[PDB]
Write a protein that binds this DNA or RNA. Structure first.
Length: 1166
RNA sequence: AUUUCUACUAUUGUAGAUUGGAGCAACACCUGAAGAAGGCU
RNA sequence: AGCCUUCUUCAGGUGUUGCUUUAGAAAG
């Protein structure tokens, strides 16, 4: 059950020292330097205003771009620092050589390197930078003037560009400008020869040199931090712990980019559309057979998309991709750009039939577009004359459905409901009421009385009665409005309920998903080309005598000195502060070293240390034919000798990695051995004065903080702190990835400094890798290949649980069967392998004890019940003060009404499904607050009492679906939100202040934590039975019937009506977003693949990433029940689930039967 | 009180859970608009 | 001319669901 897969694990750590009086002081030996560096980090940490700022920035970067384009080639003026010149040697790909000056004027570099001037490489790099930022300035100019035109003309508000592509275009443009302007603001590009008096003819350079580009840099950084801030966290730095990974150059995704364009068949699509006019591409897409192309799996997904719905290629990827594929094919870039632009051009059949009528055809338009036009304009035709091609729309709908549409009951019912809505709209037109309303009343009555119901609707007659009563006599407006809203819901959900059309929409789900994934991956890997500086800091972890750990990060652009050597030169062996840094190698680095070696005459490759003088290096065979030369034995032997006896293997001391290539007879074996053994945590020491000189020199001393490692009695209770102190043992199996990103979160106003949101919080997010050292392991990139192919993943699951069932064949296993519902969020039953109901779980309780000494107060746990079939809903694993882990019921201990009231008693309940119920009620109120706003303000009309206010809510909000109807309504929070909405609608009716109230609250965190309690329970039981256990779950993927949505009264279809309907998600929407089925599934399965003992990771379910990896697996056969085994988890069919006397409830029986259905076929199968 | 989430306590914190970043698709509603159709005055 | 409804489209927001990509040293 050992883990054979590589795993990543982000361990986030705070970097802001809390200074509360009730927080233990930590990092005291370097406290002054921590507080100094906090002020350093505080000083550089900060849709119509955004675009005004973008237009201001675009004007400054156009001015800067046009000024820089006339300076960069005047090489007698530019001078570079030595660190900048070396980074230019790496970036412009030449040899630095020997420069014996701190300031290198480009009037030097007249020497030759590989057939060119040395300064010409710098000038050509800057010229390429100018060209790329000019192209991105053109793209950003197009988007910016488009969005500005949409802004300052309220008529044209529908022409806004995509904001994600707008933001990402500015991020690429900001990177490209920043590569030039950051050395200008830092002085790494300076102009020393400006002292001579030539202002009569060279004054334009004088305005360039003394201009403050710090202002432009900070304004661009302001926009970047505005764009990059997601969730309140702004990226601060990207620190490396391995200094060879510093000064990193962007990854080349050439093979990955070319594979997506191959998958898109984009080259062949531009082949059949290049040279066409913009109207001829339109006629090509018009004359395409929509239905045969849409279902043709071998077509382009781009073509298969534009024959169902007009879906244009996104702006950023389309301009990166047009320039990408225009180059090697010799195409004109404008022609391929025109082809890419005309793909997915929106066309309206209604607007086109309005303009002209002859030559019109619904086959010219995509399936959804023409279907919508035909269905809507034919529904209007059954009660009035409509100017549209009536028989053509009939023919189109009959071709789609195979039957005579406008004779079907469903389409007729849609036409009646649309006509009813139209006549109610005319009769409601209060400003322009008709002179003769009687004939509209007659029309409504006639349409309601001649209507025929296609199926059963329970409440339709009530809606009809209320609407007819309102129009005829005027009884009620509330019931009439509710009835009209429900009829609108029915009519909206009726569109296409006649299977031939839901199939096409379900196919478009995957087709548009592949379209979006491929273009998003292409955009992410084309944006990678301009990620010039990934690493900004080089850092070490500094440990002192109290085992506190710091982060001494130093900017790589901070000054003209070498900032990799600055930290490392100050390391000693007998100092007081132990420093750590990662010494590691990967197959990624190896393949970067082998392929990029150069054997040209004038070239001095930077990788000549890595490569020895054997026979195995042949550049053409490595470059053009790598995947065939990697299997040749001469290259394997050459790579082994390059890793053993090269210059780089003795300079970097690669013999300390403990490599052994006596078993590696292949290149994949070499890469695996490198990825397995190559990790050492290089421990050195540094002094107090060295840290003082570095922090005073501008470096940042971020203190690594969490609750456990900065407490008084520093015992590791968290798994992140346990992993943190497992990393610094130097063990190979649990590594520290050298790269990690520091971010910051600005304080929220209205929050005190005693809380983390009223504090500027810096977070270090370390990545820790689990690399199995016992033999062959599967790396992360091999894993994503298996996750992306369902046949490979099916075979992997089959071989994994073949391995598992051999282990637990002749063992005395138990079976852990879990039911899921709403009455109990999960209930668990443990069975013996013969089916005997086990379970002697002691259920404890907490009571807080106030000791005489105040800091010695603690929780004492006492046993309260003995339960056998557990209700996991109110349980959480608790560790007592004696170290024993017990099961504690949260509901047994009351909680206090107001937090931080030590002298008051506890009088409130602590059920978790009550929390879910309250959040669902809040989300239902916020939904009706958006859609039915005045109805929501009517709830507090005359300052109601709580009972009559609850009665008022019961006419607006649906119940939860569990417990009594409106059991635990959050009235004191609901009335506060409605009063806040009344206040916001008063004093100006601002929309953002409304959106802070009316928008739905996220439900994922509450139910994630509530499920995490239960996952801890299941982990405790699984480890209790010595991991020789089986787990059984339902297959809750099929919805046998319909449901009503929690938000509206909307009907949620079954799986029969729509094959993509999942029972868990249908029930989630039934509860207004508070379903805990898939959360329990995903959290249990993500727990079971990483179950961690003292120092070893034990894996009990196969490797998976998505939900289509654990669903859509091979089910076992030749048994009683249909079960899908996923490691130790069996997803049995839920059909007929709901010491035999241990069953007391209706769902204890369900959990016992879920366990028993797995017991039976584990008996039969093995 | 939190790396963060959840539940707490007021114990210089507690217990469980914790892989983070960028997006993509479908849906729901809101907001800003456009097009067409029918219709009202 | 004003105005209402209806369908579709566009942009954003917030949710719900899934789904990918990325996360160690890239010179002909």
């Amino acid at each position: 059950f050992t883990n054979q897969y590589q795993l990543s694990k982000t361990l986030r750590f705070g970097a802001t020292l809390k200074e509360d009086e009730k927080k233990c002081k930590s990092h005291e030996e370097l406290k002054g330097f921590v507080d100094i560096s906090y002020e350093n980090m505080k000083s550089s940490a900060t849709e119509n205003e955004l675009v005004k700022k973008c237009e201001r920035c675009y004007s400054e970067i156009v001015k800067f771009h046009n000024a820089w384009e006339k300076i960069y080639y005047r090489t007698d003026q530019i001078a570079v620092y030595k660190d900048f010149y070396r980074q230019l040697s790496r970036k412009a790909r030449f040899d630095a050589g020997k420069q014996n000056s701190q300031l290198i004027t480009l009037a030097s570099l007249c020497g030759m390197y590989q057939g060119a001037k040395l300064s010409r490489y710098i000038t050509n790099y800057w010229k390429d930078n100018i060209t790329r930022q000019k192209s991105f300035l053109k793209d950003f100019s197009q988007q910016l003037h488009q969005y500005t035109r949409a802004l300052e003309k309220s008529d044209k508000a529908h022409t806004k560009p995509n904001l994600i592509n707008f933001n990402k275009t500015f991020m690429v443009l900001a990177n490209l400008v920043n590569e030039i302007v950051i050395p200008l603001s830092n002085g790494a590009i300076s102009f020393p020869n400006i002292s001579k008096l030539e202002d009569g003819e060279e004054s334009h350079l004088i305005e360039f040199a003394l201009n403050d580009y710090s202002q432009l840099s900070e304004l661009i950084g302001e926009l970047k931090d505005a764009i990059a801030t997601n969730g309140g966290y702004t990226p601060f730095a990207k620190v490396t712990l391995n200094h060879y990974t510093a000064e990193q150059k962007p990854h080349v995704f050439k093979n990955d980019i070319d594979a997506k364009i191959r998958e898109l068949k984009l080259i062949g699509l531009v082949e059949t559309l290049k040279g066409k006019s913009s109207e001829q591409i339109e006629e090509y897409f018009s004359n395409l057979d929509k239905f045969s192309t849409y279902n043709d799996r071998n077509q382009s997904v781009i073509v298969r998309t534009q024959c169902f719905k007009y879906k244009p290629i996104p702006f950023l990827v389309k301009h990166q991709l047009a320039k990408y594929i225009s180059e090697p094919n010799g195409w004109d870039e404008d022609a391929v750009a025109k082809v890419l632009d005309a793909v997915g051009a929106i066309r309206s059949p209604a607007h086109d039939y309005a303009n002209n009528q002859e030559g019109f055809d619904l086959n010219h338009y995509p399936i959804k577009v023409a279907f919508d036009y035909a269905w809507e304009q034919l529904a209007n035709s059954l009660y009035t004359t409509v100017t549209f091609p009536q028989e053509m729309c009939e023919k189109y709908l009959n071709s789609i459905y195979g039957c005579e549409v406008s004779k079907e009951p469903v389409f007729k019912f849609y036409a009646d409901l649309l006509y009813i809505r139209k006549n109610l709209a005319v009769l409601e037109h209060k400003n322009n009421l008709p002179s003769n309303q009687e004939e509209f009343i007659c029309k409504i009555n006639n349409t309601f009385e001649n209507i025929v119901l296609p199926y059963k609707i329970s409440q339709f007659e009530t809606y009809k009665k209320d609407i007819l009563a309102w129009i005829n006599d005027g009884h009620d407006h509330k019931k009439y409005t509710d009835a009209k809203q429900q009829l609108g819901f029915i009519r909206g959900g009726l569109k296409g309920r006649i299977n031939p059309y839901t199939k096409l929409t379900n196919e478009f789900k995957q087709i548009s998903s592949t379209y979006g994934k491929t273009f998003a991956e292409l955009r992410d890997k084309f944006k990678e080309k301009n990620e010039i500086t990934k690493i900004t800091h080089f850092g070490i972890i500094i440990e002192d005598k109290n085992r506190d750990r710091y982060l001494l990060a130093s900017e790589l652009k901070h000054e003209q000195i070498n900032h990799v050597s600055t930290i490392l030169n100050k390391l000693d062996k007998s100092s007081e502060f132990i420093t750590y840094q990662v010494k590691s190698l990967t197959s990624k680095t190896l393949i970067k070293l082998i392929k990029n070696h150069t054997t040209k005459k004038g070239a001095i490759s930077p990788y000549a240390d890595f490569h020895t003088s054997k026979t195995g290096f042949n550049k053409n065979e490595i470059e053009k034919n790598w995947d065939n030369y990697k299997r040749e034995q001469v290259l394997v032997e050459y790579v082994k000798d390059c890793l053993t006896d090269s210059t780089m293997a003795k300079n970097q001391n690669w013999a300390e990695f403990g490599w052994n290539f006596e078993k590696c007879n292949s290149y994949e074996d070499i890469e695996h051995e490198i990825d397995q053994k190559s990790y050492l945590l290089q421990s050195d020491t540094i002094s107090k004065q060295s840290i003082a000189s570095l922090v005073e020199g501008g470096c940042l001393l971020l203190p690594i903080i969490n609750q456990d490692i900065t407490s008084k009695e520093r015992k590791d209770k968290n798994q992140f702190s346990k992993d943190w102190n497992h990393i610094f043992e130097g063990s190979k199996e649990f590594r520290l990835h050298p790269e990690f990103a520091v971010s910051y979160r600005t304080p929220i106003e209205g929050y005190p400094v005693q809380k983390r949101y009223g504090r500027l919080q810096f977070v270090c997010a370390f990545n820790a890798h689990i690399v199995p050292q016992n033999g062959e392991f599967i790396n992360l990139k091999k894993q994503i290949e298996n996750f992306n192919d369902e046949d490979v993943q099916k075979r992997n699951v089959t071989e994994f649980n073949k391995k598992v069932n051999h282990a637990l064949s002749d063992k005395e296993y138990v079976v852990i069967g879990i039911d899921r519902g709403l009455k109990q969020l999960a209930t668990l039953c443990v069975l013996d392998k013969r089916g005997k109901i086990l379970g002697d779980f002691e259920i404890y309780k907490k009571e807080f004890v106030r000791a005489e000494k105040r800091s010695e107060s603690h929780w004492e746990h006492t046993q309260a019940e003995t339960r056998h079939i557990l209700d996991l809903s109110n349980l959480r694993v608790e560790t007592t003060i004696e170290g024993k882990k017990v099961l504690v019921d949260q509901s047994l201990t009351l909680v206090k009404k107001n937090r931080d009231t030590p002298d008051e008693e506890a009088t409130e309940e602590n059920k978790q499904k009550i929390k879910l119920k309250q959040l669902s009620y809040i989300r239902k109120l916020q939904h009706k607050m958006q859609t039915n706003e005045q109805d929501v303000l009517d709830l507090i009309n005359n300052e109601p009492s709580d009972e009559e206010f609850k009665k008022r809510i019961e006419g607006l909000i649906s119940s939860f679906g569990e417990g009594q109807k409106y059991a635990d309504l959050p009235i004191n929070t609901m009335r506060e939100m409605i009063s806040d909405l009344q206040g916001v609608i008063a004093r100006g009716n601002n929309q953002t202040e409304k959106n802070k109230i009316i928008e739905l609250d996220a439900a994922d965190n509450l139910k994630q934590g509530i499920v995490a309690n239960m996952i801890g329970i299941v982990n405790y039981i699984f480890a209790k039975y010595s991991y020789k256990a089986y787990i059984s779950l339902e297959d809750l993927s099929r919805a046998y019937g319909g449901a009503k949505s929690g938000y509206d009264g909307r009907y949620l279809p079954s799986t029969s009506q729509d094959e993509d309907v999942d029972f868990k998600e249908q029930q989630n929407q039934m509860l207004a977003g508070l379903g805990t089925y898939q959360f329990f599934e995903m959290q249990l399965l993500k727990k079971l693949q990483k179950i961690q003992s003292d120092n070893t990771v034990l894996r009990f379910v196969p490797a998976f990433r998505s939900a289509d990896n654990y669903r859509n697996i091979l089910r076992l056969e030749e048994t009683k029940y249909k079960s899908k085994p996923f490691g130790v988890v069996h997803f049995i069919d839920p059909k007929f689930t709901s010491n035999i006397h241990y069953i007391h409830n209706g769902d204890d029986n369900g959990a016992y039967h879920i366990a028993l259905k797995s017991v039976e076929n584990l008996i039969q199968m093995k």
